[PDB]
PDB file of C-alpha atoms and ligand atoms in Angstrom:
ATOM      1  CA  UNK A   1     166.448 104.908 255.959  1.00  0.00           C
ATOM      2  CA  UNK A   2     169.519 104.456 253.467  1.00  0.00           C
ATOM      3  CA  UNK A   3     172.275 102.835 255.823  1.00  0.00           C
ATOM      4  CA  UNK A   4     174.722 105.090 253.958  1.00  0.00           C
ATOM      5  CA  UNK A   5     172.616 108.051 254.903  1.00  0.00           C
ATOM      6  CA  UNK A   6     171.850 107.220 258.668  1.00  0.00           C
ATOM      7  CA  UNK A   7     175.751 107.491 259.477  1.00  0.00           C
ATOM      8  CA  UNK A   8     176.107 111.479 257.956  1.00  0.00           C
ATOM      9  CA  UNK A   9     172.706 111.625 259.822  1.00  0.00           C
ATOM     10  CA  UNK A  10     174.347 110.584 262.976  1.00  0.00           C
ATOM     11  CA  UNK A  11     176.642 113.940 263.286  1.00  0.00           C
ATOM     12  CA  UNK A  12     173.633 115.783 264.043  1.00  0.00           C
ATOM     13  CA  UNK A  13     171.763 116.438 267.152  1.00  0.00           C
ATOM     14  CA  UNK A  14     167.828 115.996 267.910  1.00  0.00           C
ATOM     15  CA  UNK A  15     167.718 119.970 268.106  1.00  0.00           C
ATOM     16  CA  UNK A  16     170.030 120.168 265.055  1.00  0.00           C
ATOM     17  CA  UNK A  17     167.286 117.507 263.444  1.00  0.00           C
ATOM     18  CA  UNK A  18     164.239 119.995 264.208  1.00  0.00           C
ATOM     19  CA  UNK A  19     165.930 123.344 263.101  1.00  0.00           C
ATOM     20  CA  UNK A  20     166.896 121.810 259.756  1.00  0.00           C
ATOM     21  CA  UNK A  21     163.666 120.316 259.164  1.00  0.00           C
ATOM     22  CA  UNK A  22     161.714 123.717 260.421  1.00  0.00           C
ATOM     23  CA  UNK A  23     163.896 125.469 257.860  1.00  0.00           C
ATOM     24  CA  UNK A  24     163.195 122.968 255.022  1.00  0.00           C
ATOM     25  CA  UNK A  25     159.487 122.702 255.751  1.00  0.00           C
ATOM     26  CA  UNK A  26     159.337 126.597 254.791  1.00  0.00           C
ATOM     27  CA  UNK A  27     159.931 125.452 251.010  1.00  0.00           C
ATOM     28  CA  UNK A  28     157.456 123.210 250.449  1.00  0.00           C
ATOM     29  CA  UNK A  29     153.803 122.762 250.600  1.00  0.00           C
ATOM     30  CA  UNK A  30     153.952 120.062 253.335  1.00  0.00           C
ATOM     31  CA  UNK A  31     150.417 118.955 252.976  1.00  0.00           C
ATOM     32  CA  UNK A  32     151.049 117.668 249.485  1.00  0.00           C
ATOM     33  CA  UNK A  33     155.159 118.062 248.824  1.00  0.00           C
ATOM     34  CA  UNK A  34     158.146 116.335 250.057  1.00  0.00           C
ATOM     35  CA  UNK A  35     160.638 117.482 248.247  1.00  0.00           C
ATOM     36  CA  UNK A  36     162.050 120.869 247.455  1.00  0.00           C
ATOM     37  CA  UNK A  37     163.703 122.098 243.996  1.00  0.00           C
ATOM     38  CA  UNK A  38     167.475 122.276 243.546  1.00  0.00           C
ATOM     39  CA  UNK A  39     167.084 126.110 243.766  1.00  0.00           C
ATOM     40  CA  UNK A  40     165.579 125.737 246.895  1.00  0.00           C
ATOM     41  CA  UNK A  41     168.369 123.431 247.927  1.00  0.00           C
ATOM     42  CA  UNK A  42     170.948 126.242 248.505  1.00  0.00           C
ATOM     43  CA  UNK A  43     168.192 128.622 249.960  1.00  0.00           C
ATOM     44  CA  UNK A  44     167.171 126.715 253.017  1.00  0.00           C
ATOM     45  CA  UNK A  45     171.228 125.818 253.761  1.00  0.00           C
ATOM     46  CA  UNK A  46     171.650 129.538 253.703  1.00  0.00           C
ATOM     47  CA  UNK A  47     168.710 130.013 256.304  1.00  0.00           C
ATOM     48  CA  UNK A  48     171.052 127.496 258.167  1.00  0.00           C
ATOM     49  CA  UNK A  49     173.876 129.557 258.033  1.00  0.00           C
ATOM     50  CA  UNK A  50     175.706 127.444 255.327  1.00  0.00           C
ATOM     51  CA  UNK A  51     177.209 128.987 252.285  1.00  0.00           C
ATOM     52  CA  UNK A  52     177.796 126.202 249.479  1.00  0.00           C
ATOM     53  CA  UNK A  53     178.934 127.028 246.259  1.00  0.00           C
ATOM     54  CA  UNK A  54     177.309 126.533 242.752  1.00  0.00           C
ATOM     55  CA  UNK A  55     179.467 124.044 241.786  1.00  0.00           C
ATOM     56  CA  UNK A  56     179.397 122.231 245.271  1.00  0.00           C
ATOM     57  CA  UNK A  57     175.545 122.181 244.773  1.00  0.00           C
ATOM     58  CA  UNK A  58     175.541 120.250 241.726  1.00  0.00           C
ATOM     59  CA  UNK A  59     178.156 117.926 242.573  1.00  0.00           C
ATOM     60  CA  UNK A  60     176.405 117.041 245.781  1.00  0.00           C
ATOM     61  CA  UNK A  61     173.073 116.348 244.126  1.00  0.00           C
ATOM     62  CA  UNK A  62     175.444 114.484 241.694  1.00  0.00           C
ATOM     63  CA  UNK A  63     176.590 112.224 244.624  1.00  0.00           C
ATOM     64  CA  UNK A  64     173.976 112.444 247.350  1.00  0.00           C
ATOM     65  CA  UNK A  65     170.576 112.157 245.310  1.00  0.00           C
ATOM     66  CA  UNK A  66     168.654 108.930 245.199  1.00  0.00           C
ATOM     67  CA  UNK A  70     166.394 118.013 239.979  1.00  0.00           C
ATOM     68  CA  UNK A  71     164.554 117.893 243.628  1.00  0.00           C
ATOM     69  CA  UNK A  72     165.689 116.941 247.114  1.00  0.00           C
ATOM     70  CA  UNK A  73     163.872 115.355 250.110  1.00  0.00           C
ATOM     71  CA  UNK A  74     164.249 115.770 253.662  1.00  0.00           C
ATOM     72  CA  UNK A  75     166.786 113.175 254.252  1.00  0.00           C
ATOM     73  CA  UNK A  76     168.818 113.901 251.222  1.00  0.00           C
ATOM     74  CA  UNK A  77     168.965 117.658 252.714  1.00  0.00           C
ATOM     75  CA  UNK A  78     170.193 116.183 255.687  1.00  0.00           C
ATOM     76  CA  UNK A  79     173.026 114.506 254.299  1.00  0.00           C
ATOM     77  CA  UNK A  80     174.036 117.466 252.314  1.00  0.00           C
ATOM     78  CA  UNK A  81     174.033 120.066 255.194  1.00  0.00           C
ATOM     79  CA  UNK A  82     176.103 117.253 256.972  1.00  0.00           C
ATOM     80  CA  UNK A  83     178.999 117.645 254.158  1.00  0.00           C
ATOM     81  CA  UNK A  84     178.822 121.141 254.151  1.00  0.00           C
ATOM     82  CA  UNK A  85     179.204 121.614 257.643  1.00  0.00           C
ATOM     83  CA  UNK A  86     182.347 120.235 257.306  1.00  0.00           C
ATOM     84  CA  UNK A  87     183.694 122.871 254.636  1.00  0.00           C
ATOM     85  CA  UNK A  88     183.724 125.641 257.506  1.00  0.00           C
ATOM     86  CA  UNK A  89     186.766 127.606 258.079  1.00  0.00           C
TER      87      UNK A  89
HETATM   88 CA1  LIG B 101     169.594 125.263 268.538  1.00  0.00          CA
HETATM   89 CA1  LIG B 102     165.441 128.539 265.372  1.00  0.00          CA
HETATM   90 CA1  LIG B 103     166.125 113.524 245.482  1.00  0.00          CA
END
């Protein structure tokens, strides 16, 4: 696990991590694929109750990505988005 991320992910409970995994898993054929598309990224975040804007998703992809998102990248993007609630 990349150390920078390791600390973003420390904001999440084991229960949150499991929930987020369950949502993410809807959007991949896990028996052969580890990544969702950038199009699916907003869909999984919205499944989880987040509302990222289109320009935010691109900004996060630019800053977080290591057209695809794996599970740990997705966790970091969820942690970022959870901090913009009002
Ligand atoms: Ca729960
Ligand atoms: Ca649930
Ligand atoms: Ca990626």
